[PDB]
């Protein structure tokens, strides 16, 4: 009441509704999740914001000269804090909402979730990260796709029109190819089947039979060159046989390779009750092994397989570490016989712990392993980042730029300011005209 | 497949079956399964599929050939690859009788 | 007659999704065996007097372990094929009471969507009327946003085959209310969906053919604008625009409309992409704007396609001015 | 005895992206091929994400008009696409 009724106070709100704001927004955001559970962060987002918020709440009344503190607050919360990576919380985000969206980490009733990630958008507002939440969510999710585990479609559909009404694109759009490139594809594998192999007869030896469109469009992915695998024919009929029929389904939507689809899904009556699992590659070769002869050894098949060992190193160190499959002799260079054992394992060892096995590393480690990589992005995504803004106006003074990024780059993206004079002088320079010096009248000129 | 169709185009030569080595030579090696090819290998083995194409004077499709090979010559560092590339646009502007060009 | 070797692989399959799911429940019980009980319910080569087991797949199912689930959808698969309709109707309602009561949400979906498959190959549309209403009276649920209106857009698809629209409208309606109308004005997404009503809307009015009304359902889709989603459709849609320019003779704005309907329509397949195509073509010709036919990546290796070629040698002759030659096309074809 | 002996499974590295059909840019210059030059601004044509202004019809050799013109004009084989400029 003193500070509406004596003129001056109100500003200085906008001075101190941020300062606290993001300085708690340092430990009960930043600070307080370090163990890294990804809901304990999106929490800890939660904290910071709904307390502060319902701390304006009270009297204060909106007077946005207290929201606009808030607004700068919180900006200084995710973006201004020590760590320059911005994107934590959004990489906590992306887990948990692929917790949310998955029904294997945390399960609860539908779309109530939706209201969940509701109040997380209302939070998310303030957020920058779009570049690792969008493409590693999308990559996340990707992941996930494979594996299907998930809440539901059309939730994970809502969480992305939150995203999508406040956000970029592309962000979006190419998810939604991921999304109908899954949908649709489904149904072609089922159009494969259905030209020859119809629904009730299939001419065909029969592996689980799907796969992707194996487009252009869908996917997040970098480039990484993997082994030569032989590819025996379930895998050939699986996926070969596809490209046939997919020459069917798309008559110039052409191909990009894509093996990773290939399915496996055993229903084996080796013991009076049929049963559905998932096992390993190794001893599939074994088993062939097996059919053929007790051994194959390692000379001519390492003749025969030359896998390209880029990987390997990783590979190794996974292997011997799991001493869970059953192999005939784990060496360092190589391994002079594989015609590996019988099913020496079950499930686990304990039921506290020592737990562990499917072969785990490759699958959760490769964003792990990536982070370089990910980061050389971010790099590439500041980047790109000024070069997708210096490229606006044509004709200007440099002055005229002023305060005009700031609605371009502060909620989407980590803003990035000083690269304004370098930018124009050096990216610029074609077909525009130039101010390199502003007081001269003369510049560029276009072909 | 790459030595299939190079023994099988060049035996083909052989006989002068020039049309049908340019035939079978249109199921190119590209990067199609295992083995990822060389520009300078491949776009030999373009321009045998365009002179086994125009030596049965088929223009057409060895005009498409040699477009997309044109597409193709631009990654070729070769001067004398792009010679018979040249070989092969000067059999096809032969065939397309333009003769400012 | 007998059931299938394929179905009985089916069921194979999800006992074991039960059982790995059930891994994780190591911890827990009560869904050990019941997969069994479907094992030996549909499997054990016996879907026929294997009654009992359906009966002990009854006992209790989880979300992980839950085979029993797949049991009593065989024996909705059964009833047609083996011994009748009424049981499949009964224990199809028992997998209805399912929503929420202990069982994973994502596996029953997609498991009745392909009750619905069997029931679409089973009772054409007649029977699997019923079956989907059966689903709708499971749907009440004000939680579903999309759920019970899905089940519905299969249904109300039913009714365009069927032409059953004081139905169809009916749910059109609802569904309207399920968006902004009611003050709703929210759901998975935009609004509702609104998309999709639009969609069976102009089916349901070119099925009708009333263009004029066409006309106002595209008035309507002025208003895609307020909701996004991307669904399959997307291309049919444009291509109403298009004819709506067809009804209008406007093909200025039909070029564009065939345009991105093509380009639609290459990203669903070819019911109308070829038709849509041909439109295009034609389009082409009354903007009399010939310079780029096929021309954006796509469609000069989709012309190739000899049906839709002469659409090729029609903007040829057109372009050209063979008269000849372009109304021997004509004549010709 | 036969219960899990380690069958086909699904399994995914890193493959793809952005794909391998090139499909480049009109590169004589080079607006990016979504992008609507300044040869389609006069024109304004309603042009494809891999679309600057590409024509591979018969005309087939067509890029930003006058630019590929220009690539033209001086000798007229214009190699790129190889055919006359659009
Ligand atoms: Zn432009
Ligand atoms: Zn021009
Ligand atoms: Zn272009």
Known sequence: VLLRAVST????????????????????????????????????????????????????????????????????????????????????????????????????????????????????????????????????????????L???????????????????????????????????????????????????????????????????????????????????????????????????????????????????????????????????????????????????????????????????????????????????????????????????????????????????????????????????????????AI?????????????????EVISQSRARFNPSISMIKKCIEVLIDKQYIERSQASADEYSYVA | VASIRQHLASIYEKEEDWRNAAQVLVGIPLETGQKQYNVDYKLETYLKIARLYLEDDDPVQAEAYINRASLLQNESTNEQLQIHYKVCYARVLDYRRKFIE | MSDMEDDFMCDDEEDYDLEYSEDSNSEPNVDLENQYYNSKALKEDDPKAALSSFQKVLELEGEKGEWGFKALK????????????????????????????????????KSINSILDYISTSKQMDLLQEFYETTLEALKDAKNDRLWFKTNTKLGKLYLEREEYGKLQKILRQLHQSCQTDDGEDDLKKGTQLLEIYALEIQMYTAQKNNKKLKALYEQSLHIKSAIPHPLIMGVIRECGGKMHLREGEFEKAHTDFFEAFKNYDESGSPRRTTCLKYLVLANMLM?????????????????????????????????????????????? | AKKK?????????????????????????????????????ANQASATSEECTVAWGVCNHAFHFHCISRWLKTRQVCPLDNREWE
Request: glycine share 2%.
């Open chain 1, 9 to 148: 106070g109100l500003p200085h709100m906008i001075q101190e509704l941020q300062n606290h704001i993001h300085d708690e927004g340092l430990r009960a955001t930043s600070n307080l999740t370090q163990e890294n559970m990804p809901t304990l962060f999106v929490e800890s987002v939660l904290e910071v914001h709904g307390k502060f918020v319902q701390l304006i709440n009270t009297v204060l009344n909106g007077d946005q000269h207290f929201m606009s503190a808030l607004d700068k607050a919180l900006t200084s919360v995710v973006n201004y804090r020590e760590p320059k990576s911005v994107c934590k919380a959004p990489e906590l985000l992306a887990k948990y909402c692929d917790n949310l969206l998955k029904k294997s980490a945390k399960g609860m009733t539908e779309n109530e979730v939706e209201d969940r990630l509701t109040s997380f958008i209302t939070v998310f507002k303030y957020i920058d990260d779009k570049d690792v939440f969008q493409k590693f969510y999308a990559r996340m999710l990707a992941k996930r796709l494979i594996h299907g």
């Open chain 1, 150 to 384: 998930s809440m539901s479609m059309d939730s994970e559909e809502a969480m992305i029109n939150k995203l999508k009404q406040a956000c970029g694109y592309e962000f979006t759009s190419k998810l939604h190819r991921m999304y109908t490139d899954m949908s649709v594809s489904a149904d072609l594998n089922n159009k494969f089947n259905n030209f020859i192999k119809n629904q009730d007869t299939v001419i065909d030896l029969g592996i689980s039979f799907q796969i992707y469109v194996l487009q252009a469009g869908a996917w997040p992915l970098t480039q990484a060159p993997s082994s030569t695998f032989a590819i025996p024919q379930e895998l050939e009929k699986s996926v070969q046989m596809f490209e046939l029929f997919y020459s069917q389904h798309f008559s110039g939507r052409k191909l990009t390779w894509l093996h990773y689809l290939c399915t496996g899904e055993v229903k084996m009556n080796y013991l009076g009750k049929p049963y559905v699992a998932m096992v390993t590659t190794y001893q599939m070769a074994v088993l062939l092994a097996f059919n053929n002869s007790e051994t194959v050894s390692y000379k001519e098949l390492q003749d025969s397989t030359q896998m390209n060992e880029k990987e390997l190193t990783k590979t190794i160190k996974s292997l011997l570490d799991v001493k869970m499959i059953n192999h005939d002799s784990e060496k360092e260079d190589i391994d002079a016989e594989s015609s590996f054992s019988l099913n020496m394992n079950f499930s686990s060892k304990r039921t506290k712990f020592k737990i562990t096995t499917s072969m785990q590393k490759d699958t959760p480690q490769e964003m792990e392993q990536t982070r370089s990589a990910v980061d050389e992005d971010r790099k590439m995504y500041l980047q790109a």
């Open chain 1, 387 to 403: 070069v997708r803004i210096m490229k606006a106006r044509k004709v200007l003074r440099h002055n005229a730029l002023i305060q």
């Open chain 3, 74 to 109: 065989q024996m909705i698969k059964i009833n047609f094929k083996l011994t009748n309709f009424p049981e499949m109707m009964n224990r199809y309602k028992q997998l209805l009471t399912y929503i929420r009561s202990a069982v994973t949400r994502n596996y029953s979906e």
């Open chain 3, 288 to 333: 009399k704007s010939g310079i780029n036919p096929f021309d954006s990546q796509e469609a000069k290796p989709y012309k190739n396609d000899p049906e839709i070629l002469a659409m090729t040698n029609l903007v040829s002759a057109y372009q050209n001015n063979d008269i000849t030659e372009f109304e021997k096309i004509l004549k010709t074809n």
């Open chain 4, 5 to 41: 002996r380690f069958e086909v499974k699904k399994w995914n590295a890193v493959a793809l992206w952005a794909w391998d059909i090139v499909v480049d840019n009109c590169a004589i210059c080079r607006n990016h091929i979504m992008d609507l030059c300044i040869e389609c601004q």
